[PDB]
């Protein structure tokens, strides 16, 4: 049975404060006895701005019942800093939260704040934790964004070595080997190879990247991720489409095509062919493939491809 906090001698001096809903509120929640009682005392603690161990314990009680309570998380971080608590211990508690399936924007943001403040000389162990976290949940948006922040923040401090960058690309390649249709891993690749300030972008480096993209396309021709990356790559580095066209042309009927269950044509291969015609100032030929996309090969987007066609004609 639950022992009310009004009966606990540790809380005897605190007068609980009720939720101020006003008269007859809409969307009221039938809070459990535990949650209501905890919030009544949290309202009191926070109003008087108490920074104590019991207050810290109360915040943990609440976020376990409601991991999304942003007010309580904000108060918890204030408690950690005021009381000069071990930030490393709090990180381990956050690891326990993930294992116990307690998750939200708030937990990940809490981790970010902890790591910002700890500010380790080498963030390798946190990077490792993130990798392990991604394995069973390989497309978790928040986890991927946090990985971006971590490398971005710590790189500005000059704390990411070339070896560390190297092993990150290795890890990213393995994620794409395990699932070439993981768009999150393609996005990570873009950061590592193109967008990050330290990205290696010599002429042979761009050559290597094109080989990788084309090989990915030949492996999985219907992979929208690979096509989007190709198109984004060529556009970002102002590279002509025509010289690469021989590698794409077979999918409309440098590494070349070799695959069973590959019906032709591939819609995005046609978009490539069309844009390569526009590059050559061949607007009529471009309109013809847009028309084919509109009427025959990608009819879901009939209106869009017609729009693109009318842009030429």
């Amino acid at each position: 049975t639950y022992i009310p906090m009004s009966q606990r001698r540790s809380w005897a001096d605190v007068k609980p404060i009720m939720q101020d809903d006003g008269p007859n509120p809409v969307v009221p929640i039938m809070y459990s006895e535990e949650y209501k009682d905890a919030m009544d005392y949290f309202r009191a603690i926070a109003a008087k701005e108490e920074k104590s161990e019991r207050a810290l314990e109360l915040t943990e009680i609440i976020v376990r019942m409601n991991p999304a309570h942003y007010t309580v998380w904000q108060y918890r971080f204030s408690l950690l800093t005021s009381l000069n608590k071990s930030l490393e211990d709090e990180l381990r508690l956050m690891n326990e939260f993930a294992v116990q399936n307690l998750k939200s924007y708030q937990v990940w943001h809490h981790r970010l704040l902890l790591l910002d403040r700890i500010s380790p000389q080498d963030p390798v162990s946190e990077i490792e934790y993130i990798h392990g976290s991604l394995l069973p949940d390989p497309k978790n948006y928040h986890t991927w964004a946090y990985l971006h922040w971590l490398y971005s923040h710590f790189s500005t401090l000059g704390r990411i070595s070339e070896a560390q960058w190297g092993s990150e690309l290795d890890w990213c390649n393995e994620m794409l080997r395990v699932d070439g249709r993981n768009n999150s891993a393609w996005g990570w690749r873009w950061y590592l190879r193109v967008s990050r300030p330290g990205a290696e972008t010599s002429s042979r480096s761009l050559q290597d990247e094109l080989i990788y993209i084309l090989k990915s396309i030949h492996l999985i021709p219907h992979n929208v991720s690979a096509w989007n990356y190709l198109r984004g790559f060529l556009k970002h580095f102002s590279l002509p489409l025509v010289p690469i066209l021989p590698a794409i042309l077979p999918y409309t009927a440098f590494p070349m095509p070799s695959p069973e269950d590959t019906p032709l044509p591939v819609p995005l291969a046609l978009e490539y062919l069309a844009d390569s015609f526009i590059e050559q100032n061949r607007v009529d030929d471009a309109a013809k493939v847009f028309e084919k996309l509109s009427s025959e090969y990608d009819q879901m987007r009939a209106g869009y491809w017609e729009f693109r066609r009318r842009e030429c004609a």
Binding site: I29, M30, R43, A68, D179, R181, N182, N183, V224, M300
Partner: protein, 485 residues
């Protein structure tokens, strides 16, 4: 009207090809393709005259959805505690859904809605996810509360709009406390930085006439740098050290693309010099249309490349389409019509796949096999509204608005935090007020643009792009705060 918007039933449904390369993504995709296509096979074609015998009827079950919303509007079970920090959203999802469904709330219930939300308003500025004595202000419930007051409130003393007017200075100050030098906003004190905050803040600031130069500084740069190589937008951009360069921090996602496109659009009506920094409109349009699923997945939208279709993206991605389209139109005119997405297929997804099975709880859902909820009810319907009606931003309507604007009428100007943070003078402030107000009311329903799949009984009301409230709510609300009534 439907020449370039083919019905799902008129197209060949085939799985996404494997290329003999199995992966976890394809396993999940094939499973979803089966769930959706089988329901389509069980359901009568909404477009047919001879609605075939034995098949499920796909008509919009408006009364079932009204009941679903009514049943949890006055009491929520203990399990909803996970949304205790989001109660203004529960209000918004309900009252906006009812608006779309054409169901009126009586004045007594509206008064309750107003009262509930006003208790979420803290004196220091902004709304939180619960009462002011329980939760701190947050940009997201601020948007949800403000929009809900536009829907359920009025201009009388118990109507709530008066309270918003008096809170204008404090809400502005809360917005300024959230501001970061790089142009991002934290969602709350010690909170995360992302483009959802920017969107929510920009809507509220536009509606309440509290836009200043200092509020907007670098905001355009932050948003613009969220655009990824894919054409859509991520949650945030990182400023590499004023900054030497800004880099997107994640995948293009439907939710963040909606927020970014809408934020950008709101910024284009502020007459500041070299503002806003441009986005790649064509790439954003391309990304938007590419997220519409294949016939086998019912022509609903997915939120990111190689993920699964979901009814809520009908609003997030679908509702971004008219905004992206207008931006593309403006760019082409700056150098110098069929639908841009399949308006019919999207309606078919909603009617056939996103509705709860008949004779049950009602409500709309993510996809077959998923429980309906308030969030999906609201966003499915908002998307359905965008597909049903041809909403365009009209330059001639904006011009008409400019001609009727009265600059001698208005609420007191907000006092900037920094002495030079305001408008240079009164003329430039009034020109800004005019532009912001006139453009906010620029969205019109195109004559002859209506397509109601399954017949006129499926028709719901017209939501406004960017704001996501009915035009009949937006007009008197914004007119009140700009004194243009």
């Amino acid at each position: 009207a439907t020449e370039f918007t083919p019905s799902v039933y008129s197209l060949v449904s085939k799985p996404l090809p494997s290329n003999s390369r199995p992966s976890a993504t394809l396993d999940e995709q094939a499973e979803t393709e089966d769930l959706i296509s089988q329901l389509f096979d069980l359901t009568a074609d909404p477009n047919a005259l001879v609605s075939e015998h034995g098949k499920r009827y796909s008509g919009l079950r408006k009364q079932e959805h009204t009941q679903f919303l009514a049943s949890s509007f006055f009491q929520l079970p203990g399990k909803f505690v996970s949304l205790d920090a989001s109660r203004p959203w529960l209000v918004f999802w309900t009252v906006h859904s009812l608006d779309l469904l054409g169901v009126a709330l009586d004045q007594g219930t509206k008064d309750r809605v107003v009262s509930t939300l006003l208790h979420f308003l803290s004196p220091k500025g902004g709304f939180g996810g619960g009462p002011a004595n329980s939760q701190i202000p947050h940009l997201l419930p601020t948007y949800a509360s403000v929009c809900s007051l536009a829907i359920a409130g009025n201009d009388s003393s118990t109507g709530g709009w008066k309270d918003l007017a008096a809170a204008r200075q404090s809400i502005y100050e809360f917005f300024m406390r959230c501001k970061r030098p790089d142009g991002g906003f934290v969602v709350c004190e010690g909170g995360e930085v992302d483009v959802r905050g920017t969107y929510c803040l920009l809507v509220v600031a536009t509606l309440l006439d509290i836009i200043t130069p200092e509020l907007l500084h670098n905001v355009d740069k932050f948003v613009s740098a969220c655009q990824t190589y894919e054409g859509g937008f991520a949650c945030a951009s990182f400023p590499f050290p004023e900054p030497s360069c800004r880099v997107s921090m994640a995948e293009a996602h439907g939710g963040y693309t909606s927020c970014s496109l809408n934020s950008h659009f709101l910024l284009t009506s502020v007459p500041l010099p070299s503002f806003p920094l441009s986005i790649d409109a064509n790439a954003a349009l391309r990304w938007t249309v590419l997220q519409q699923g294949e016939p086998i997945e019912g022509g609903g939208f997915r939120g990111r490349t190689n993920k699964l279709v979901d009814g809520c993206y009908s609003w997030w991605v679908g509702g971004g389409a008219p905004v992206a389209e207008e931006l593309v139109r403006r760019e082409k005119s700056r150098k110098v019509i069929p639908p841009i997405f399949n308006r019919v297929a999207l309606q078919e997804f909603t009617l056939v796949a996103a509705q709860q099975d008949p004779g049950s709880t009602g409500g709309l859902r993510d996809k077959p096999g998923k429980r309906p909820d308030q969030y999906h009810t609201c966003n499915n319907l908002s998307g359905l509204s965008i597909a049903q009606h041809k909403m365009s931003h009209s330059p001639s309507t904006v011009s008409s608005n400019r001609l009727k604007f009265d600059a001698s009428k208005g609420l007191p100007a907000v006092k900037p935090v920094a002495p030079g943070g305001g408008w240079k003078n009164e003329d430039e402030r009034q020109n800004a007020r005019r532009e912001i107000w006139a453009n906010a009311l620029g969205w019109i329903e195109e004559e002859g643009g209506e397509i109601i799949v399954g017949g006129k009984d499926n028709r719901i009301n017209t939501t406004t792009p960017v704001f996501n409230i009915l035009g009949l709510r937006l007009k008197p609300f914004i007119n009140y705060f700009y004194c243009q009534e």
